[PDB]
Write an enzyme that holds these catalytic residues in place. Structure first.
Site, PDB file in Angstrom:
ATOM      1  N   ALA A 151     -24.007 -38.149  12.374  1.00 12.81           N
ATOM      2  CA  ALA A 151     -25.037 -38.330  11.356  1.00 12.81           C
ATOM      3  C   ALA A 151     -24.580 -37.666  10.052  1.00 12.81           C
ATOM      4  CB  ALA A 151     -26.383 -37.755  11.824  1.00 12.81           C
ATOM      5  N   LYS A 152     -25.264 -37.986   8.964  1.00 20.47           N
ATOM      6  CA  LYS A 152     -24.979 -37.362   7.680  1.00 20.47           C
ATOM      7  C   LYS A 152     -26.215 -37.517   6.807  1.00 20.47           C
ATOM      8  CE  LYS A 152     -21.688 -35.816   6.707  1.00 20.47           C
ATOM      9  NZ  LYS A 152     -20.743 -34.681   6.322  1.00 20.47           N
ATOM     10  N   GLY A 153     -26.618 -36.434   6.133  1.00 13.45           N
ATOM     11  CA  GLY A 153     -27.807 -36.465   5.307  1.00 13.45           C
ATOM     12  C   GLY A 153     -27.634 -35.662   4.035  1.00 13.45           C
ATOM     13  N   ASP A 197     -23.162 -28.254   4.675  1.00 15.98           N
ATOM     14  CA  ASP A 197     -22.196 -29.153   4.080  1.00 15.98           C
ATOM     15  C   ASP A 197     -22.087 -28.780   2.595  1.00 15.98           C
ATOM     16  OD1 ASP A 197     -20.565 -31.452   3.445  1.00 15.98           O
ATOM     17  OD2 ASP A 197     -21.485 -32.537   5.124  1.00 15.98           O
TER      18      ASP A 197
END
Ligand SMILES: NC(=O)c1ccc[n+]([C@@H]2O[C@H](COP(=O)([O-])OP(=O)(O)OC[C@H]3O[C@@H](n4cnc5c(N)ncnc54)[C@H](O)[C@@H]3O)[C@@H](O)[C@H]2O)c1
Ligand SMILES: NC(=O)c1ccc[n+]([C@@H]2O[C@H](COP(=O)([O-])OP(=O)(O)OC[C@H]3O[C@@H](n4cnc5c(N)ncnc54)[C@H](O)[C@@H]3O)[C@@H](O)[C@H]2O)c1
Ligand SMILES: NC(=O)c1ccc[n+]([C@@H]2O[C@H](COP(=O)([O-])OP(=O)(O)OC[C@H]3O[C@@H](n4cnc5c(N)ncnc54)[C@H](O)[C@@H]3O)[C@@H](O)[C@H]2O)c1
Ligand SMILES: NC(=O)c1ccc[n+]([C@@H]2O[C@H](COP(=O)([O-])OP(=O)(O)OC[C@H]3O[C@@H](n4cnc5c(N)ncnc54)[C@H](O)[C@@H]3O)[C@@H](O)[C@H]2O)c1
Ligand SMILES: O=C(O)c1cccc(-c2nnn[nH]2)c1
Ligand SMILES: O=C(O)c1cccc(-c2nnn[nH]2)c1
Ligand SMILES: O=C(O)c1cccc(-c2nnn[nH]2)c1
Ligand SMILES: [Ca+2]
Ligand SMILES: [Ca+2]
Ligand SMILES: [Ca+2]
Ligand SMILES: [Ca+2]
Lengths: 409, 410, 412, 410
Positions: free
Chosen positions: B100-102, B141
């Site tokens: 996932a990435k947000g 991140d």
């Protein structure tokens, strides 16, 4: 199956002096479930089955038990199987109660996608009655690890990713290492502990093994690697003998090349019907139940009988073999390695972190050894055979877990 | 960016596996894409509105995992590729997660510390029902850090109870794991050891040139130095230092900590940083930037091993040239996975209610990096492919078979 | 469509200026609460896989659960889908129903899918969004490419996750909790709105002549409802022809003719007409019930009607609007005039929430109360802002959403 | 008896509808069958163990609905037939429920009131996850009453919050509905008005004989009397009273309330109860037991109408005989449905958070019974069948339509 469990409970219940109203409660299952399972077939037409789940007891933890896809669903036998799970888990001290479920169907009449739709509908119909800390199903007759993948996938839509909701999963989806050898290896661990009572080892004994499938193959391998002399092995098609011990590693090579036992070159071909009366120290039935009865019992020449199959000794042979000094390691304990490693799969999933195969086997040994000690201790309190040591041990643990929890609303 | 590299490696690995094109299409479509309004009052009482997002790519192998970026650049295709890359990376090292990435499209340096807290909590309120300890586990991140994660933990827990495993990268005081700072550089060295064992060699047999001297480069060099390797050249963005007898990395680290610059280190000779990749050594370790090895300088590389610690340091031209010169390249998707692996261990420790000591974290990290190299190597055997494709086919095949086992009926 | 994007943007910007909307509030009102895209993969009847992307734009919920259709349609342009969800937020506010706006769908062509593939696709879509919708969260409805059977499948699938939930979706079959009065709702609402408009002039529907463009679900019921109130329907067109009668068409007989598969041109109780002359026909009232973009600079100066009731969406482009205005033409705007359908849709939800269905007389009694109350509010707004009816409606709805937002506040 | 009558009527209605045989199999299989252990401590400290059960037959048209029986006899086939009859009955009067039936195998006379409370609460704990306001809504039945329902409500609400609609038949003080006592008897008279209106007749044109004078018989007699009907004969288990002028039912009720016997009422002539079914009247209303009309007495019935208020009073032999004499029989599945209908209104009032007055309850009861008769008569016209098959085909088809609309894919 039914009749053995009923008698063993009644024998163990009277040894313990079980309170009659506690006994009545312990016989009544926690919950019985029947649900409609209707699916479209691959051609679009409907077929309707009834799925079921008997949840017998949860005094010691979540319920545990297989799912059978099989057309014969006699309620009394399914109930007995769920009760037997309750006693068996208590014998090896794993924190579960007993359950048993299934769908009255013949899986060989159903395509692979029909089996998937049937399994997902079944999961939709019982999702609120199972759960990682409620009831944890497993494969049985007619189901396998692919069946568990479908249950896992469907259940997780209702409750989120729940790898511990089911055991016997594919390795790719949180299944445990060491499952295949679990029962056969557990048989040998139990046998090590039993012989330790006599200061003897497996390397001191000769062995005859009836049946050569998943239980039989792994038991033979573990005995052979521990210095035991496997002098006779049979299955449904033939038998082989070698008074100096069959090279079991070589025998397994032959079996893997689709060869038959009697055709093995490192032994002498044998009549399978002579396997139980063969001369040896230790007899291990790994095939079928009811192989030991009054007929053949006096002609058994073995000193120890390790019950790996379920119920190989009917009550007639038990009485006969007992008086002759034959010691019988009972099925509810001896073959419990499979359900024990099933507990470990559940543990590994709730811990979010898998064990390697060496850790699985170390814990399997620890659990099987501590279980034998507890059985033997019970035999010394009640002055009974090993079968009753095991049944009184499990029955009492369920009883006092039930009594500690209490009865008020 | 990371998008071209990921698409190319996916397509190549897909051809090798003979992946069914309809399965391939499904694996490329993300499970779920979320965009939410994140409005906060500023310290001065005025309003500002941002858009937060979470791309949840795949969950066939377990809960989704991935960072949260506070950054003004929110190109949807790039974010999808990063989320997709997570799915393959977690599969390569066999940790039970999907990708996932947000993030939030904002510039964090325009926001005060209290505005950043309010923004983090509003974002959490808007996505709390989409994440969870067994659903999707965020991490730091670009533009976020362990303090950001503490805020997510605190706000998320109001809705679902105390859930330290809902996020990794936490402060040590709130359930963060030991061994996190060294995780990537140490994982690179475990990976490099396993590769060299295939040749019966040790790190102590080799010379090393390291590009980049940040969190990965400092720890990789330290771990190499403590194992007897000879780090003969180190660069960063301002300079480079060289010593053919091996740089004393312990002294180099004290120098960096004392506000020193590489070219002012006296235990070596100043070097042009552009000479780093073509330096004479056995092992080259890019730990700085992507795209540093291209068709120009690839033929001038004089190392036999390239350990890809940075992401995408070798473009396809160099990968081609280097192969038929006998250069063995350990791919980034595997070599730098020590960080995501220890991130998994933090989650495990939280799930288990009981923290590990640092010896245990590093023993498991080593076990995980080693078992991963063996699996990659086995794949190379079956597919007759280099380490990069051994790794990508391993991860891609694991996601595909998890998907096939779970099935498609409604 | 594309006209809905341009029209919704222009109307929003115009109303925002009249209200003097604070620009950071406006920025927030334009950003949707939540945008979702999900994979929807199913096995086809032949056993092979097909993969689609489903989506749900949840624009605004300041005034209540979100409400909006689900489109099975291949064109899924994000800006258009976003505009449609936003238009629903303004529309529900205009007629004062306690919903916000949403819009969702699956990028697919339903004619490529069998009835069993459509069911599997609908259930998978529901499984993928069940946690994002709900009776008090987001209530879908039919739209292009879906129908009451689609809603039955959503209801059946959603209820496995949350128990029997009839209010989670509207447009259901009557057998599963659908409301009476759905078929006539939009056309009947059109006539109720027209009654309220004409009452401002002390006039009634029986005083006017009517020309109606389009004779589908909206056109037939509107014509029927006008006819039963004594209005003289002097012209009707559809895609295949047109019929005129300066004495008034017997609409009851015209509807029987249509029901027997007859064509408007072939009707015996009128004279055949060129459909291209419907909009310039000589009448008091013009009612576009067919298509958008029918009134532009080419023809606006030739319109002879004194009232035009926008039953279709966006039938008047901005050029015609200005031209018709200066001529004294009064335009009842689409956002309000056709709102009967979404209003009865709210009533279905209410009946399910109350566990107890209404009879049709009750549905229609409430439909009339809602359209009549809405017109009075629009007219009151026109008084305070000195603007046309179109801006009266948009400022009313925009202001209601703005005030709901401001009352709810901004602190976390 | 409910098993053979319900099975016979289902099979007959299914053959009229041309029901697909695979759909029919699904409709006969209950949604879910539950059995649970119910163990309590007695007042004296000893244990007792019972088995509780809930058969949830069908929920295609809405939540399940059905009584809870505290009674020792718990034959599984009879309990299934009763739950299934509920499913058809609710469909006939078009209330949004399916059918269920549950209970506990016990003798309530053996238990003190506090033991009964504990047993009720334990039962509720064991099934709280299977019932619910929109899932399955229990009600009183043999051996249970409104006090039992208060205990279920009280215990259920600990698990899911205050939930007045989870059970019907509650005390007025805890959300029960007005008009519940008269519901069945008044419903019988509404059904009869609708039937007689087909002939342009009114209740005041008819004479009535009523077998049974309990909760159904007293209210039907009262509702007939207030509409100008002549109640010319009433019987119960101990005697009967006759008056061809019409019995003063107001006085007859007051006599009953004062512990009086029918044969001792002075405003009539005492009668042999065995002569009630052959009495001279236009309308005969069995309100006591099933199986009272058979081939022995069927030829001797003098009524032109039989209103089946009791369950299954006419066996198929008498039904055959009576229809050939021109007798019109309003079937039990419809005629006595006022009780279940007002139970629906109780649930409605609870979910609406606002109780109705008795005027509104009776107004809605009349609307529901009237529309159900119209639908039955329309079905009779469509299938050219008697009222009994008009009712069963109506209910069976509505359930079939609802399950077909809901579909079969997983
Ligand atoms: N596998 C487990 O986890 C497990 C656990 C508990 C108990 N058991 C019991 O172990 C027994 C065998 O299980 P398994 O998994 O090894 O089965 P399997 O099917 O893998 O092997 C059975 C073996 O018995 C042989 N056999 C069959 N019929 C025979 C006959 N009439 N005479 C002689 N040999 C015969 C077969 O040829 C085969 O070699 C069963 O009684 C089972 O209930 C197994
Ligand atoms: N830290 C992790 O856990 C992790 C994990 C996976 C991948 N990576 C990748 O590793 C690389 C470095 O990560 P990091 O955490 O060490 O970063 P960092 O910011 O800690 O250090 C970067 C280093 O590179 C140097 N550098 C920058 N531009 C340079 C240039 N043009 N030429 C030479 N040196 C240059 C900087 O001066 C610094 O020494 C990045 O590509 C990152 O994506 C890091
Ligand atoms: N039906 C509703 O519930 C509803 C609600 C709100 C708004 N609307 C709007 O109303 C309009 C019509 O909706 P509907 O449900 O009546 O559609 P419909 O498909 O049922 O009927 C459309 C009618 O327009 C006619 N038509 C098509 N092209 C034409 C043309 N070029 N010239 C003349 N007539 C033409 C068709 O032949 C048909 O008579 C659309 O703009 C729609 O967006 C409908
Ligand atoms: N009460 C309800 O809500 C309801 C609803 C639907 C159906 N029913 C059916 O109505 C019937 C009666 O119900 P109720 O509540 O009025 O019962 P009840 O017990 O209140 O009254 C029964 C009456 O029948 C009389 N009776 C009993 N046996 C008799 C016999 N052999 N001959 C003559 N009279 C006799 C009794 O003396 C009493 O007057 C039953 O068949 C029941 O299944 C009742
Ligand atoms: O940024 C991400 O996407 C992400 C998500 C989870 C863990 C890690 C990680 N830790 N160390 N290196 N990478 C990164
Ligand atoms: O299209 C939507 O967004 C939507 C949502 C709910 C109801 C209605 C409706 N019914 N009639 N007209 N419109 C439309
Ligand atoms: O006993 C049942 O099955 C049951 C369930 C709900 C309501 C009623 C009822 N009320 N009045 N008459 N019958 C009965
Ligand atoms: Ca029990
Ligand atoms: Ca996908
Ligand atoms: Ca917004
Ligand atoms: Ca059924």
């Amino acid at each position: 199956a039914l009749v053995a469990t009923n008698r063993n409970f009644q024998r163990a219940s009277r040894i313990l002096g079980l309170d009659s109203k506690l006994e009545k409660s312990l016989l009544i299952p926690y919950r019985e479930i029947k649900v409609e399972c209707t699916i479209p077939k691959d051609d679009g037409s409907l077929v309707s089955y009834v799925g079921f789940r008997i949840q017998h007891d949860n005094a010691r933890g979540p319920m545990k038990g297989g799912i059978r896809y099989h057309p014969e669903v006699d309620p009394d036998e399914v109930n007995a199987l769920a009760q037997l799970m309750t006693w068996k888990t208590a014998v090896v001290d794993i924190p579960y109660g007993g359950a048993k479920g299934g769908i009255g169907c013949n899986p060989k009449d159903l395509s692979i996608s029909e089996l998937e739709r049937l399994t997902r509908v079944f999961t939709q119909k019982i999702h609120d009655l199972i759960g990682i800390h409620r009831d944890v199903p497993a494969p049985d007759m007619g189901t396998n690890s692919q069946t568990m993948a479908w249950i896992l996938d469907e259940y997780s839509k209702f409750h989120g990713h729940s790898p511990a909701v089911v055991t016997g999963k594919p390795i790719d989806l949180g299944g445990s290492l060491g499952r295949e050898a679990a029962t056969g290896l557990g048989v040998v661990f139990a046998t090590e502990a039993l012989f330790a009572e006599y200061g003897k080892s497996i390397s001191d004994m000769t062995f005859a093994i009836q049946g050569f499938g998943n239980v039989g193959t792994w038991a033979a391998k573990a005995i052979f690697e521990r210095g035991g002399k496997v002098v006779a092995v049979s299955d449904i098609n033939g038998a082989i003998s070698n008074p100096n011990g069959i090279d079991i590693a070589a025998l397994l090579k032959h079996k893997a090349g689709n060869g038959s036992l009697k055709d093995f070159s490192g032994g002498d071909a044998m009549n399978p019907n002579d396997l139980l009366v063969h001369d040896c120290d230790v007899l291990i039935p790994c095939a079928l139940g009811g192989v030991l009865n009054k007929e053949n019992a006096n002609d058994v020449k073995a000193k120890f009988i390790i019950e790996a199959a379920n119920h190989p000794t009917d009550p007639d042979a038990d009485e006969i073999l007992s008086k002759k000094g034959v010691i019988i390691l009972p099925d509810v304990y001896a073959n419990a390695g499979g359900v024990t490693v099933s507990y470990f799969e559940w543990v590994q999933n709730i811990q979010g972190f898998m064990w390697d195969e060496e850790k699985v086997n170390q814990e399997l040994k620890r659990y099987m050894t501590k279980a034998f000690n507890d059985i033997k201790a019970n035999c010394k309190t009640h002055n009974c055979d090993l079968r009753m040591g095991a049944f009184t041990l499990g029955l009492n643990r369920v009883a006092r877990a039930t009594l500690l929890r209490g009865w008020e609303a």
